[PDB]
Design a protein around this nucleic acid. Structure first.
Ligand SMILES: [Mn+2]
Ligand SMILES: [Mn+2]
Ligand SMILES: [Mn+2]
Ligand SMILES: [Mn+2]
Lengths: 105, 82, 94, 99, 97, 106, 99, 85
DNA sequence: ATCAATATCCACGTGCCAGTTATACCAAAAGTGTATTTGGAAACTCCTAACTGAAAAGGCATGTTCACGTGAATTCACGTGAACATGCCTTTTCAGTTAGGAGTTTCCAAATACACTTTTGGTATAACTGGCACGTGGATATTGAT
DNA sequence: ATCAATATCCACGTGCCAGTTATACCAAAAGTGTATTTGGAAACTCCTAACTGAAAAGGCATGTTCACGTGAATTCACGTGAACATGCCTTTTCAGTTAGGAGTTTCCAAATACACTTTTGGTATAACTGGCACGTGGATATTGAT
């Protein structure tokens, strides 16, 4: 009696991802390798964002990740910024950027 | 005092948005142009959200209706469910 | 008599796996909840069209892989395909 | 006697102040009344979750801020520092929203 | 072996053309464009209907879903006339059975 | 006597085929009978709207046969059809004649 | 004695000429080589349907003509009539391709 | 058995780039434009072909089909009519 | 350059709320175990169309010369946003009454699911012709030199 | 204004192929009719959270002074357009070779389908606390006038 998530070495629920594949009308049949594979990719991507966001939280000397930290983690990583270029982060803010020609001296 | 609702977006508020966008100098005619753009945007989104609300046979526009409406415009939004 | 699913449990577990001394606010937790659902939708959708284009009735792990290549930029694609194939091999042998 | 900063310094001060922060810049109540007026012209007697109004304020402010970024680029492209209505109209025509 | 039947909308595009312009022909390239248009508009509408029923936990795509999809996807005046043509064909289909 | 559902609903587009592709496409588990009829009527109308504007463009060019150029002129000159097909490219379509005024001489 | 049109007359003549037509402006054989080269250096031993190359050439020329329209707007916005690489970069930045 | 392929972006000649700019309604063209245009065209062509070939690999095929190109362009947001559905 | 006015961090301490924690149900999934059905991987062969090549022709590409008009550089005047102080009204922050979201349950009109019959759409070969591409000269419009 | 030089609009006349037509083949859908399953409209009832109201706080509007950035004007060097001579590389049309796409058949590993068992995730009340917002003084940085 073991869940498929531990049998695959993941923290994300493989059984649920299998259920959402069936009830989402994506196709009539779902092999068991698909929810495991998809659950692995969702956990990996989640970890990559949480890592960079945590570093942003420490660099502002905070211990808890707020949306601002997630925004700084995404808009500063090139590939994450490409994946979510058409996404708006609530309570995210903008990256500090002043065009050089506006500066004095 | 009587004035339109589109004027509630006050000139210091539009100025604050431009400052977050890195703008240094703002011509006067911008403030009316910005109010027109802000209205066109809100009109397109709410029309789609309301269309979702009617189809659910509801009378309360929900946060998911607006999220699905923004998602339809290509303006995806994270952090309000779904 | 109501139940709202989310991914907050597993996002928190993964958070403790990478930053054991870091918490996460509720707003930031809702953002992660949207990100998991969006990335699921894009992958599952692209996989569905792949199965259809080739007249197939099953979404297999091979489809999810091809969808990952199309959706994820370079280095993110390489490591995502790896972690995916790693978990599938481990699931099959066990 | 009165100390006055030269034109442009307070602005650059506001830029660093408002790019560092995250809060909403439009006031809630003027925005919420603007939403209900617009919603009334589509379907009468509508009620809104508090979260639904907030989701619209986050979405529209994020849209206008990103539009001022592209507007500012057009102004700098014309050897200017002042954004003008023709700058916004160029940025919206090239995005594909207008024309 | 006989090659499979490659379906298209060539017949029905040609019918609708003869109703509208009875003395105008169409080239195979333009007919190819029209085939791409029908299949494109089909997948936008049917997809938007699929998401619509899913947001409301419904397992059926009814004509009510197709209509709300049309309201969301078509611009103003084109949506008005399209909803009209759709409703007429639906009620006429109902009364004839 | 058998009569097709397309004549039963007074349409020139195939209602039965549109029903099959709705099931075959995995858009939902069940499909009522109104949805294929309604959608078939919409596709037929939009087809007619484009062929009307295209044939006019073909006639203005002294041609008796529609080519993709006429379809391009039709779509790009009608605001609502142009908005519906903004992110679309017509093979062998061309562009609308448009010279920015500041480039003209004198 | 010899007849010379002034600089710009034959340009405007060509603009009208090439906006009236629809045939492909890039050469067929150079374009097919370019497509095969790019495809080769991604995966080896590939064959192409003739239509597949034509589809790519259709989308490519359509993409560049559109990008030139937005480029032409950026130069005119800066009080010019000559398009320059910084115009194209501004067009692709606001579009979201270059960001 | 085939000749090696290299530096084919130069087949996109300067007159061909000028014609595309004329149809785009451009009157005067700087000299630095032609290389920048080649750079843009190459990035575009790479992105659509990369996706096109990926569909071809998943189908276990050795022939890139026009449908693979159409799917490629569609998922880039460049929908194309006239080469199959 | 020396200063003075103003803004800006920095280190420390403060209460408060949202975050973390834990406990108890428990229905809702998820897992298990069985019988059952089926898609599609594998053989094979058919045959479409992609690749290859040769050879001739002229439509364009290349590169040079040269002049002209455009872009960049520089000046300059004035008018419009920025800065700032002030006066105050709209926004912000809290309470208790019901609209309507959302749950539960019944049951009928409507959906799928089978088998069977019927005919519409697609392929094909043969057949057909007029629409359209191409080539031509000629009348007209435009352009640039004067 | 006059003028010639050049390109362009337009009707005419021409063969050829693509498009239209008609025949039959026919398997593949689509329609028909039966029995079967089930979703979701309809009652009903429960209960979040959306609206209404009244009272407190700091951000908005107005008006004044001026600094400087914007547009308009003028110059000049040179880079880009226009033209032509030169000839190469693409276009065009045909032919035959075979890779590999695509059809058909067989058949098994892997899917679904039920009933059944196990526990995990979500909710809720109650509890808990330390992380962060916020206030402060006081040291430094910045900015602008002399
Ligand atoms: Mn190579
Ligand atoms: Mn000049
Ligand atoms: Mn028939
Ligand atoms: Mn072979």
């Amino acid at each position: 009696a073991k869940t498929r998530s531990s049998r695959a070495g993941l923290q994300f629920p493989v059984g649920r991802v299998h259920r959402l594949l069936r009830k989402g009308n994506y196709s009539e049949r779902v092999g068991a390798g698909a929810p495991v594979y998809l659950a692995a990719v969702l956990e990996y991507l989640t970890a990559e964002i949480l890592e960079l966001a945590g570093n942003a939280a420490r660099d502002n000397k905070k211990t808890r990740i707020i949306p601002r930290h997630l925004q700084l983690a995404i808009r500063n990583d090139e590939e994450l910024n490409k994946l979510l270029g058409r996404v708006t982060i609530a309570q995210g803010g903008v990256l500090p950027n002043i065009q050089a020609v506006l500066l004095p001296k | 005092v009587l004035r339109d609702n589109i004027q509630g977006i006050t000139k210091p508020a539009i100025r604050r948005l431009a400052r977050r966008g890195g703008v240094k100098r703002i011509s006067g005619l911008i403030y009316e142009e910005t109010r027109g753009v802000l209205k066109v945007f809100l009109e397109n989104v709410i029309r789609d959200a309301v269309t979702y609300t009617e189809h659910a046979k509801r009378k309360t526009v929900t946060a998911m209706d607006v999220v699905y409406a923004l998602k339809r415009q290509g303006r995806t939004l994270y952090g309000f469910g779904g | 008599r109501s139940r709202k699913e989310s991914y907050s449990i597993y996002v928190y577990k993964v958070l403790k796996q990478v930053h054991p001394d870091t918490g996460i606010s509720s707003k930031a937790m809702g953002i992660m909840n949207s990100f998991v659902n969006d990335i699921f939708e894009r992958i599952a959708g692209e996989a569905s069209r792949l199965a259809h284009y080739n007249k197939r009735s099953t979404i297999t792990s091979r489809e999810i892989q091809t969808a990952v290549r199309l959706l994820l930029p370079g280095e993110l694609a390489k490591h995502a395909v790896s972690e995916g194939t790693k978990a599938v091999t481990k699931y099959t042998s066990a | 006697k009165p100390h006055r900063y030269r034109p442009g310094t307070v602005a650059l001060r506001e830029i660093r102040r408002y790019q560092k922060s995250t809060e909403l810049l439009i006031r809630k109540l003027p925005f919420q009344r603007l939403v209900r007026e617009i919603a009334q012209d589509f379907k009468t007697d509508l009620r809104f979750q508090s979260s639904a109004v907030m989701a619209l304020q986050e979405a529209c402010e994020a849209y206008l801020v990103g539009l001022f970024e592209d507007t500012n680029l057009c102004a700098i492209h014309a050897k200017r520092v002042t954004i003008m209505p023709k700058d916004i109209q160029l940025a919206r025509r090239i995005r594909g929203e207008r024309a």
